[PDB]
Amino acid sequence: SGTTNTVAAYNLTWKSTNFKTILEWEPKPVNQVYTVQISTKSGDWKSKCFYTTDTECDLTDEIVKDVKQTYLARVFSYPAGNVESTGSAGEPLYENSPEFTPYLETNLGQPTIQSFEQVGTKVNVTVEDERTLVRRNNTFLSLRDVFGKDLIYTLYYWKSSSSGKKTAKTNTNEFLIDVDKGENYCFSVQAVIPSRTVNRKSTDSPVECM
Amino acid sequence: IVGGKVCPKGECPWQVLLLVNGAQLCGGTLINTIWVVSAAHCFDKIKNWRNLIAVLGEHDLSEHDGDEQSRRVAQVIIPSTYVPGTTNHDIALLRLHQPVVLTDHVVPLCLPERTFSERTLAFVRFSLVSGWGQLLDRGATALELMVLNVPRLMTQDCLQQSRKVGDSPNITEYMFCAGYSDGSKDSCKGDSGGPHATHYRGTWYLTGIVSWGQGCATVGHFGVYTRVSQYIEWLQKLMRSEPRPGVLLRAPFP
Amino acid sequence: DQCASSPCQNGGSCKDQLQSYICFCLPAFEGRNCETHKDDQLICVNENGGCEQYCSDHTGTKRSCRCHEGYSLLADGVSCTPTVEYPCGKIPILE
Numbered sequence: 303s304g305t306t307n308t309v310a311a312y313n314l315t316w317k318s319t320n321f322k323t324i325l326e327w328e329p330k331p332v333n334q335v336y337t338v339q340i341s342t343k344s345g346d347w348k349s350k351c352f353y354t355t356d357t358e359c360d361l362t363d364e365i366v367k368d369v370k371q372t373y374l375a376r377v378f379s380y381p382a383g384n385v386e387s388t389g390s391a392g393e394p395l396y397e398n399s400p401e402f403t404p405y406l407e408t409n410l411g412q413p414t415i416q417s418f419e420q421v422g423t424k425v426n427v428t429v430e431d432e433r434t435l436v437r438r439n440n441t442f443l444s445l446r447d448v449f450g451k452d453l454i455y456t457l458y459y460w461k462s463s464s465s466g467k468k469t470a471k472t473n474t475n476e477f478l479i480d481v482d483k484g485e486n487y488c489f490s491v492q493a494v495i496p497s498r499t500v501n502r503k504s505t506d507s508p509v510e511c512m
Numbered sequence: 513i514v515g516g517k518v519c520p521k522g523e524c525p526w527q528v529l530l531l532v533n534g535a536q537l538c539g540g541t542l543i544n545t546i547w548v549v550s551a552a553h554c555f556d557k558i559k560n561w562r563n564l565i566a567v568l569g570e571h572d573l574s575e576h577d578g579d580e581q582s583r584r585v586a587q588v589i590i591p592s593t594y595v596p597g598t599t600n601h602d603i604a605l606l607r608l609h610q611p612v613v614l615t616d617h618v619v620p621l622c623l624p625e626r627t628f629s630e631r632t633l634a635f636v637r638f639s640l641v642s643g644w645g646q647l648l649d650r651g652a653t654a655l656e657l658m659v660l661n662v663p664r665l666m667t668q669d670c671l672q673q674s675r676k677v678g679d680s681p682n683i684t685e686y687m688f689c690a691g692y693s694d695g696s697k698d699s700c701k702g703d704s705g706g707p708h709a710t711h712y713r714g715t716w717y718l719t720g721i722v723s724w725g726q727g728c729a730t731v732g733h734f735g736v737y738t739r740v741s742q743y744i745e746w747l748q749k750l751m752r753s754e755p756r757p758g759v760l761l762r763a764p765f766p
Numbered sequence: 767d768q769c770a771s772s773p774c775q776n777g778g779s780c781k782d783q784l785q786s787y788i789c790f791c792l793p794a795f796e797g798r799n800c801e802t803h804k805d806d807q808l809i810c811v812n813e814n815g816g817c818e819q820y821c822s823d824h825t826g827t828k829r830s831c832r833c834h835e836g837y838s839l840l841a842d843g844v845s846c847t848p849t850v851e852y853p854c855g856k857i858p859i860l861e
């Protein structure tokens with residue numbers, strides 16, 4: 303704040319799923335516009351979302367350029383009257399966001415069971431290689447393409463009427479739990495990055511039984 | 513220039529060396545063949561406004577190759593609002609008795625359009641500071657031109673990160689911070705008046721002038737640089753304005 | 767579901783999530799709804815307006831580029847070339 307008319311943005315938080323990264327913030331603009339600026343520890347700052355009355359800003363295109371780097375972002379405030387007001391130190395009022403490293407923080411969207419079939423006395427559960435916003439050379443990249451070998455999975459399965467909760471994992475992309483010869487089984491999957499220290503596990507993929 | 517690197521002879525062409533009777537006074541910058549820009553405070557004492565010498569092409573004060581060019585400083589102009597002994601409005605526009613010769617070793621730095629300085633240059637992370645100042649605090653001064661590549665901060669961050677001092681002069685809108693607060697590197701005592709040249713797309717512009725700092729590369733502190741862009745119309749007003757009697761003119765400001 | 771109302775504008779796909787969506791945009795679009803035109807943004811505050819040196823915004827008309835006191839504006843409308851031997855801000859040896 304440090305206000306008299308122009309209020310400072312606050313609560314800057316990153317909303318990122320499958321690298322689709324959107325910075326959001328407070329407060330709902332009142333007689334003032336915001337401009338988002340982003341950079342890397344040692345890079346120049348790039349401005350985004352010019353003079354907007356929004357409380358969000360999409361930064362996908364900048365972050366996927368190198369989801370390995372750590373990005374710091376900051377929002378500027380300007381009275382709607384003029385988009386160039388001299389603060390006190392002569393510069394605009396702005397606030398900094400928390401640091402953001404796509405690779406380690408963007409949560410993995412809810413997985414989706416691609417196509418599971420029967421190979422015999424067991425079930426071959428499969429998960430669709432999710433599509434990310436990490437646009438690489440005109441094309442996009444699948445989670446497996448991005449995290450390569452850092453992405454594993456978990457398979458929670460209930461049986462006909464069930465009685466217990468079972469789990470199975472495979473770093474590949476194909477589960478393979480051994481089932482009996484009757485009792486139908488259900489499959490609830492969830493992408494996981496065990497080497498993570500925050501959003502390690504995702505959300506339980508919608509269920510698909512028999 | 514604490515923690516720098518010797519500026520390869522020729523790569524700091526706008527670097528001016530301001531001498532007095534033969535002793536180093538400060539550094540300065542060539543924004544034009546007869547116009548040097550330095551730090552106001554560098555003249556708080558100057559008693560012989562005649563031995564005031566400006567040296568370009570300079571590089572190694574030890575040996576004397578043939579690329580140097582001396583020039584008696586004709587006039588020394590500082591802002592009307594500068595108050596000797598204080599931190600604000602620390603900038604000076606020097607005029608040489610006679611223009612220097614442009615050569616591969618003597619080229620001026622561009623004095624950017626204010627707008628440009630404000631919208632673009634200001635957000636280019638790094639810029640080079642340079643001079644023959646001290647290499648450590650009470651340490652010795654450089655014999656070979658030293659240059660440092662430092663990062664700029666907006667005053668809010670500068671305040672948020674520096675250790676609050678007893679009476680740390682406010683970081684007014686005529687100065688900006690650049691450097692590191694981890695004791696690493698920074699400009700120092702003999703550098704005042706030196707350029708803080710920013711590179712933008714193949715061209716270098718004068719965005720800062722060495723002024724003050726707590727010590728030199730003191731932990732939890734940055735180095736304050738005079739925000740050259742508050743002073744552009746000012747500089748260009750003077751450069752056209754016809755000469756004035758005295759040596760130490762005190763041009764009005766704004 | 768979610769991608770029902772098809773929030774993703776300007777041709778962007780829509781890989782929604784539970785209680786939310788995710789717009790995949792076309793190279794010239796960005797935003798939660800691919801709403802933003804990577805084009806409609808040619809202003810000096812943006813990226814020096816695309817100019818190599820100086821930039822001037824204009825009322826209801828394309829921004830203009832200009833060059834420094836010793837340069838000249840190339841044919842592309844955004845580039846500057848030296849019109850003199852030793853132009854400011856250029857390091858002769860390296861050059």
Ligand SMILES: *C[C@@](*)(O)[C@H](CCCNC(N)=[NH2+])NC(=O)[C@H](Cc1ccccc1)NC(=O)[C@H](N)Cc1ccccc1
Pocket residue numbers: 538551553554597598599680681698699700701702703704705722723724725726727728729734735736
């Ligand atoms: C004249 C210049 O050579 C020299 C440059 C020092 C640059 N140092 C860093 N760390 N960037 N400047 C000084 O010697 C100034 C002179 C001065 C100017 C205005 C008011 C008082 C003195 N002195 C200092 O920089 C000293 N550290 C003193 C000081 C001044 C203000 C705050 C803290 C210390």
Ligand SMILES: *[C@@H]1O[C@H](CO)[C@@H](O)[C@H](O)[C@H]1NC(C)=O
Pocket residue numbers: 682
């Ligand atoms: C220093 O900063 C304070 C804080 O706003 C301001 O009131 C004052 O005018 C500035 N100059 C002085 C008195 O040091």
Ligand SMILES: *[C@H]1O[C@H](CO)[C@@H](O)[C@H](O)[C@H]1O
Pocket residue numbers: 768769770771772773
């Ligand atoms: C349709 O999709 C959802 C509805 O919940 C919303 O986000 C969009 O704004 C709407 O067009």
Ligand SMILES: *[C@H]1O[C@@H](C)[C@@H](O)[C@@H](O)[C@@H]1O
Pocket residue numbers: 777778779780790791792
């Ligand atoms: C997502 O994939 C298909 C639907 C293409 O039309 C793309 O342009 C779209 O963004």
Ligand SMILES: [Ca+2]
Pocket residue numbers: 570571572573574575576577580
């Ligand atoms: Ca020499």
